[PDB]
Each structure stands twice: as C-alpha cells, then as structure tokens.
C-alpha cells in the first residue's frame, strides 16, 4: 500500500487588509464549494466524471463559531450545487485546532490504506471574518485549555508564545531579533504569491525588527505584551484548499501509473498529540512536533537533509524558528543560523514556506494543513510561478501543528 | 486484520429531569470532568492499572457542540490530561464530528488506524455536555447539524421540525401509524426504567400518554405547520454523559496478553461509513438511504442476513427514527414497521431486542457519546452485564446504527461474541 498525491486547488486567502476583502463576502459554503470544484479540474473530474471518489474528509476548526456551523461532512456533498452526485459517500468533519488540515489527511490516508477508498478528497476550509478580533480571539481560545488559560487575555493564543518567546531568548537559545529575520523572509515571499493574504505588502526588516507603532504591542496583557510584535503574528484568513488522493488501485481506475509525471507519492504520515492541561516545562521545544517529524521520515528512511523543501506551521515567527528546531534541519539554539544563512529562502538550499506561510499567505485554520501539501506539490510540479523553484525538488515534507505543540502532523512526499 | 472490542464505560446520562441534575447545592459535571470520567472508567474494565495506562497508541474523541455549549474545541489533547499516573502524552489524538453520528466516527478512525498499524490498541470516547444553555439556545446550537442558513428558518427548535415533516408525510403515505410512534415510545421508556444509567430511568407513563391526548406532553413546536406532528414522547433527550471504549488488534492482544477467543472480548468484522447531501433534501422522506446504505454494507462485509443476529442498537433520535431504523435495516420490511414494534420482537423478551437500555429517547442523547454507547451496550448484553435488562438468551451476533443529521451521515458495525 502506497499513497499518491494527485492534485488540488488552493483558493485565494482573504481577510481584512486584503483588497479583496469587502458586494457580499465569500461564505464558508461558497469557499468550500470553490475549493472542492477547483480541485476537480486539476484532477480532471469536473462535470459528471465527479463521482469516482470513495471518501470526503473536511478539516475545519471553528465553523460552529464564526459561521455558526458544524456538520460540514454532508456540506461537502452538495457543494456541486444535476452534476451534483457525491451523495451517500463517507463524509466527516475532523478537528485538531490549527492542525485540523493535516488530520483531514490522516483520515483519507487510513481509509485508502484500508481499502474503503482508493480515491479520496481532503478539504480544509476556514472562514474567520464574521466577528471582531476580540471576539475572534476568544473563539480561537478553544484551541487552548480554555477555563484555565483564557484568563490571560481576550487574545489568549498570542499570550502563550509571547511567553515561549520571553523565556527562550533569556535562555540564550535565539534572538528575538531572529524573529524579525523569519518575518521579513516569509513576507517578501508572500509578495511573489498573489494568493497570499499579505501579498500586497511588505516593510523594512527594521519595521519587522521592532521600534514600531504601526506594528505595536497590541496585547491587552501587561506582562508578555512586548514579547510579541504584530510581525510575529499570523494572519486571520479565509480560504480553502482541497486535495485528491489515490492508491495504485485508484490510479488504475483513473488509468494512471506509479511514476506518471502528473503525480507525487506519499510514504509517510505521523500523528502525535500531548496534554492539553499539563503545559511543557521546556518552552524551547515542540516535542509533539519533534516527535511527529522524526517518525514520518523514519518511516520513509531519510535524513533531515535528504530533502529539498519544506512547509511548516509558522503560526508565529517564533513557531517557524522552533519548527526549524522541531526538525533536524536545524540544531539546538542554532536557529539564528539558517534563517540568516537564508537556506530556508527560495534560493536557499532548503526553501521553506516559499509562498509566505501562515504569516503572509495567511492562516485559515482548517485550510492551513492542506495548503502545505499542495504547496509542496506545485513546487514539485513547477507550478509555483514567480516563486517556483529553480532547482526542482524530488523530496519534500510537511509539519502541521495544533495549539501549543498540542497536536502535530507530518508527511513525506517524493516526486515521481 | 481483525478488530476486537475489549471493554469500556458509560457514565450516567443526566440532564434536567434527572434527580442528579443540579438546580440552584453542588456544581454540575464538566465536559472535562465528564471526559476524564469516561476515560478513567474505561481503564479499569480493561485493567489499565494506575500506571499501566500507557499501552494505547491512539485517542479519538467524538464530540459535536463542545465549542458551543461548553465553549470548547480541541478536545484531542484534553483527553491526554484527563488522568489529572498522567502519561498519555504525545500520542495521536483528535476530535471528530459528524453531528449525531460523531460517536460512530470516532470509532472509524481508531478502526482505520489499527488496521494500518499506527495503533494496535486505541481508545474512542464520545462525550457531550449540553446543559449550559436554554433549550431555545440549545436548539439553535443543534441546528448546526442541519443546513443552517436555509433551514434554521423553520423554528428555534429546528431539528424537531424536519422529522415532524418526515412524520406528517409518511403517515399519509400509509406507510405507518403515528400511533406506531407511541408503541416505540412506551417500549424504550419502560426499557429505561430497568436501567439506572438512563436519563429517564425514573419515569414512565401510559401508552395513551405516549399516544397523544396530552398537555404534559404537548405540541411545543413554535412552528404552526408541523407542530402537531410531534409529541414530546417522540423527542429524544438532551443529556450529558460520556462513553469510552478500548479496542485492540491481535497484536494489541498479544501485548495485552490475550486470545482471539478469550471470553473477555467481542470482535468486530464490519464498519461502514456513508454520508449524503447536506443541501439536497431527500425526495423520499420514508427512507434513510444513507442509513440504509451503511447498514447493508457492513453486514455484507461480514456476510450475514438481517436476521442472523439477535440484538441491535439504533439511532432513535425520534420514535420516528427508530421506526425508520427498523426499516433502514432488513429487520423490517417497507411500511411494515407497525408490525415488529407491536410484535414486540424489538423488546427484551422479543426475538430481536433493540435499545434494551432505553435508547436516545430514555437512556438519553449526549450526542458525541451516543455513537459509542450503542457499541458498549451491545457488548454488555453479550457479556451478561446489562443487569436488570440483561438478556436471558445471550447473543453471539450483534450490530449498530448511528446517524447524524437527517440521514445525512450514518455509521454501522458488526460484532460477534467470542
């Protein structure tokens, strides 16, 4: 049993600060329908041929809250509205905070590997633009241990990293200044990607560094307030991303080949999750994410250098740093290196978040997990346009994270 | 690859009308509490001794409206520290959701995992606290299981309205009596009276009271169209409670040191998922096709007829559902639901005991939990554990049928006693 990425579609990521943000805004249903249908063409399923799927997996976090909506499993089925025929197929919403996307994958994964499916669709989506940021920051706290952590601020989720930050610099583990380097990189990266939430924007590294008013310590908190600049914060984005997956059997039905140019194969997927209550005593580690990483690669049998490209959960500049660390692409404390070495950059030896990552491309939660993969696919298939890689990678991987290293998902992809 | 049910634990189902429910002398149970309970409880029945609790490879939570009632999502890691011995850390965990079938789904995940080999031993836990808000409020939250923007329009009690309409129609099709919906009702209630776990254990009334002609049992629907097509009898319960279950592979057994025919267990040989169009509403309201699909598949995977079994647990979100459930499986033929419900074969002394502990109507309906409860129930009856509703004639063959929404999602399973 082996798994091939076929294709998919990432919608544009919009939200407040995007010129596309408002005519009436896009709906979660719309957004969903789009990401689905869009995935069909790139996979050539579109008109009536759209019924060769055995399973639908939705990855969403806060539908029930922002858009007052759960039960998106069957909502998948009628995103075709005649041509509408997904009816009576396995469908389900899954949820793991910010890693809901990677999870949506793990389901389809296990299914085909069972044989329930040989062809499946995983779609992440996330509309978050229906409420205030105060309100939305509350809804976000559902990813935390609410009753004992919302206590921090109305912007609860920022506060946890400000603290992971605050500590980790004084441990002489890296410069908060390194958190500006990451920032600059992914932003200018976003400037090469028209899908990006923050494509139409950039500013000085110094502006990303500190000394800012347009980039303030917005935290209502009076303790970890300065340990976070708006730079380091991700985006509140709307948008979807769908992906079609197949088995060798699924291929045969589709009439394809295990080495057919059109595809990329997956040979690793690893899930791991920790204690929502018992907070890490080592804030300079993403153990879950460290765990998840190590497993996947070990399942495929490669070293953390044997690859060329990566997409990781930069919910904060901080995260990306730790992400570097949370994988064997970077050694302990030495995150300051590769970020400045610029190996993580597009011309760098190890391009990472070439389209901008969560910071710039944006962070529609459910969607984020799927986006990573599709991104790695396009770079593998020369599709990344003005941030397309010169030197095409045949080996790539992903790292999706929910909460505070609470959940983590990883994957191994090989270009064929 | 083959799947053995090990054991588990169902907590008591409480909620407004249960003497255990607190109205302003003590503080109610929390989703977190409720979760911890169901987890820990599952451990002993499985002997996962104190620190021996770390032989699991995967945690699957089934919840629906945590984010709403209790303002809480991300229950995956919330599992990990329900031990506060606390060492579930850094294991695969995830919340899944499929409205009312979220429980069955939680199962399908663990299922596929062990079958992969990611796990050989997994825990699926359903839980659902729904008692933090008004019923008006709660009925809204419930509408998230519907196609909200185009269906909340019915009433603040949206989900009731859809069945009142499935009802309204189906009687005039001469498919069954609304009076049959009283027969189902009485059964599961008196059934609940033999089960102290039941939400509605401490209650019963006349069949006539379940039939109609009632004021204590009114047409509460704010709606003025399908209002009379539903009696409070036919409505399920708004319950709090959890149910956890430990599952293993032959490998998991060997680690646990067991045997594929060891008395302590029951094996699963079928699981089927299916789901339809949240938007395109059924033109045949006298059918649970999804649920019909799901059913047929599972059994066909195991290779049995719908009579080759002895016992069942099905999604009686309404008396109506159960009826259709009967139909949605080959235990009952089209229109002829009025039969077996009156034949009383579905009853405990009946040839085909169904929802012996009371089902959703009486035992109660904590949504996430419901899917898991079915299985555990089928287990206990198989293991003589059902006490005052324990079966005389023990079954070696059983099955389940979980449903989300309006036949929108359905899950089914095949269990064989060994």
């Amino acid at each position: 049993k082996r798994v091939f990425v076929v294709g998919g579609h990432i919608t544009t990521f919009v939200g407040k600060g995007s010129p596309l943000f408002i005519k009436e805004n896009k709906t979660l249903e719309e957004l969903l329908a789009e990401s689905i249908n869009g995935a069909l063409q790139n996979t050539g399923l579109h008109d009536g041929r759209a019924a060769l799927v055995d399973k639908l997996v939705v990855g969403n976090f806060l539908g029930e809250l922002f858009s007052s909506q759960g039960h998106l499993g069957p909502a998948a089925v009628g995103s075709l509205s005649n041509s509408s025929a997904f009816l009576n197929k396995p469908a389900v919403r899954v949820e793991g905070a910010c890693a809901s996307g990677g999870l949506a994958v793990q389901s389809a994964w296990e299914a085909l590997l069972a044989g329930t499916s040989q062809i499946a669709l995983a779609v992440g989506v996330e509309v978050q633009t229906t409420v205030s940021a105060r309100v939305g920051g509350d809804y976000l706290a559902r990813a935390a241990h609410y009753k004992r952590q919302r206590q921090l601020d109305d912007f609860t989720f920022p506060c946890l990293f400000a603290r992971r930050m605050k500590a980790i610099q004084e441990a002489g583990h890296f410069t908060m200044e390194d958190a500006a380097y990451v920032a600059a990189k992914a932003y200018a990266s976003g400037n090469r990607n028209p899908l990006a939430h923050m494509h139409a924007r950039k500013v000085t590294l110094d502006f990303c560094t500190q000394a800012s008013d347009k980039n303030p310590n917005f935290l209502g908190n009076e303790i970890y307030k300065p340990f976070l600049r708006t730079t380091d914060c991700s985006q509140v984005s709307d948008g979807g991303a769908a992906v079609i997956l197949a088995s060798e059997e699924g291929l045969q039905k589709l009439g394809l080949s295990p080495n057919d140019n059109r595809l990329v194969e997956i040979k690793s997927l690893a899930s791991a999750a920790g204690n929502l209550y018992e907070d890490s005593p080592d804030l300079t580690r993403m153990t879950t994410s460290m765990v998840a990483a190590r497993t996947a690669l070990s399942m495929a049998g490669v070293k953390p250098e044997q690859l060329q490209v990566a997409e990781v959960h930069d919910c904060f500049t901080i995260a990306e740093l730790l992400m570097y660390e949370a994988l064997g692409i970077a050694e302990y404390g030495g995150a300051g290196a590769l970020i400045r070495s610029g190996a993580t950059a597009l011309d760098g030896r190890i391009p990472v978040n070439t389209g901008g990552g969560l910071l710039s491309f944006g962070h529609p939660v459910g969607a984020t997990g799927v986006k990573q993969v599709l991104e790695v696919y396009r770079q593998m298939k020369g599709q990344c346009g003005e941030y397309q890689m010169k030197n095409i990678p045949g080996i790539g991987a992903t790292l999706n994270m929910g909460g505070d290293d609470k959940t983590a998902v990883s994957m191994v992809l090989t270009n064929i």
Side-chain angles (χ1 to χ4, degrees), chain A residues 2-416:
Chain A
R2 264 156 66 131
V3 8
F4 313 99
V5 185
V6 171
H9 175 248
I10 310 186
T11 88
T12 309
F13 291 0
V14 311
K16 204 139 186 173
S18 194
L20 260 179
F21 187 61
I22 309 177
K23 188 73 172 60
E24 210 64 275
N25 266 285
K26 266 181 187 168
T27 71
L28 191 57
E29 306 79 311
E30 278 159 354
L31 249 184
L32 170 59
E34 173 167 348
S35 327
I36 292 173
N37 301 289
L40 299 170
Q41 297 87 19
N42 315 20
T43 49
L45 294 163
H46 39 285
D47 303 314
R49 186 172 157 72
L52 308 161
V53 200
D54 319 330
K55 186 173 183 186
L56 316 185
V57 200
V58 177
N60 175 262
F61 189 20
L62 304 178
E64 318 190 315
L65 284 160
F66 284 117
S67 335
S68 291
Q69 202 59 29
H71 206 180
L72 301 171
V77 177
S79 285
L80 275 48
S81 277
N82 45 70
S83 57
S84 194
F86 255 140
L87 275 76
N88 303 314
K89 289 174 179 284
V92 44
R93 171 261 184 110
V94 310
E95 185 277 286
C98 299
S100 319
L103 297 174
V105 185
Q106 195 169 200
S107 331
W109 181 51
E110 290 163 347
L112 315 158
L113 289 193
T116 94
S117 44
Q118 312 299 347
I119 283 152
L121 162 64
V123 49
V125 66
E126 205 68 63
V127 175
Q128 325 187 88
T129 40
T130 55
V131 302
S132 132
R134 286 180 162 184
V135 187
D138 175 35
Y139 293 2
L140 190 53
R142 271 63 163 179
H145 182 343
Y146 196 84
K147 278 73 175 75
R148 72 110 193 253
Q149 278 179 340
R150 171 67 198 277
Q151 304 161 331
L152 301 189
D153 195 27
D154 306 85
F155 297 119
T156 306
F157 192 44
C159 278
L160 279 78
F161 280 95
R163 294 209 289 188
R164 283 194 160 254
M165 179 63 249
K166 178 172 193 306
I168 201 171
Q169 85 237 23
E170 309 185 2
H173 184 273
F174 57 65
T175 72
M176 190 166 167
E177 317 158 84
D178 274 298
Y181 258 80
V182 152
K185 180 200 70 67
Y187 245 103
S189 298
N191 295 134
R192 339 290 173 70
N193 178 24
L195 288 176
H197 189 157
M198 287 285 99
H199 164 55
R201 213 189 204 90
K202 191 245 293 189
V203 245
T204 91
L205 169 274
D206 270 320
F207 188 84
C208 304
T209 309
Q210 214 165 113
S212 297
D213 190 341
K214 300 185 177 179
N215 179 82
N217 303 320
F218 60 95
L219 272 183
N221 160 265
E222 278 68 29
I223 313 185
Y224 357 103
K225 196 175 188 166
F227 296 91
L228 184 84
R229 341 160 188 97
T230 313
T231 87
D232 311 275
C233 315
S234 286
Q235 289 313 296
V236 183
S237 320
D238 312 14
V243 52
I244 274 67
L245 306 99
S247 73
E248 328 81 275
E249 299 92 35
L251 304 193
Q252 178 171 335
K253 169 158 309 171
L254 267 14
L256 279 101
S257 179
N259 303 285
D260 186 297
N261 78 267
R262 301 156 178 177
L263 65 92
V264 170
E265 176 176 39
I266 309 176
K267 308 188 170 187
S268 291
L269 205 178
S271 177
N275 196 311
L276 186 70
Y277 322 77
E278 211 57 38
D279 303 0
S280 45
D282 190 23
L283 283 195
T284 87
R285 258 183 276 247
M286 298 313 210
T287 59
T288 325
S289 317
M290 293 184 82
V291 176
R294 307 314 304 194
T295 313
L297 55 97
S298 320
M299 302 163 56
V302 316
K303 55 195 74 172
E305 294 76 9
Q306 198 170 330
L307 82 149
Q308 304 108 341
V309 74
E311 285 270 357
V312 313
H313 204 101
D314 54 287
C315 53
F316 291 93
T317 48
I318 312 168
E320 179 157 8
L321 286 173
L322 299 163
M323 277 310 224
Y324 290 156
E325 287 276 22
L327 194 38
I329 63 143
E331 316 304 324
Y332 197 77
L338 280 191
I339 188 45
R340 296 191 162 104
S341 169
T344 49
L346 177 54
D347 294 28
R349 68 192 180 102
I350 191 75
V352 166
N353 292 17
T354 57
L358 293 62
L359 294 146
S360 178
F361 198 153
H363 190 25
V365 190
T368 297
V370 189
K371 157 183 91 51
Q372 298 183 325
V373 181
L374 289 183
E375 277 291 84
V376 173
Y377 180 70
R378 294 148 57 88
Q379 289 292 7
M380 268 183 176
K381 319 308 262 185
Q383 294 297 92
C384 285
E386 296 297 315
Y387 60 99
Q388 179 50 45
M389 288 174 70
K390 169 193 176 183
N391 323 74
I392 263 53
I395 303 301
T398 68
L399 209 59
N400 199 10
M401 158 188 304
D404 192 326
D405 190 47
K406 298 321 181 179
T407 316
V409 194
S410 160
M411 261 159 294
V412 148
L413 311 95
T414 290
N415 200 346
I416 336 195

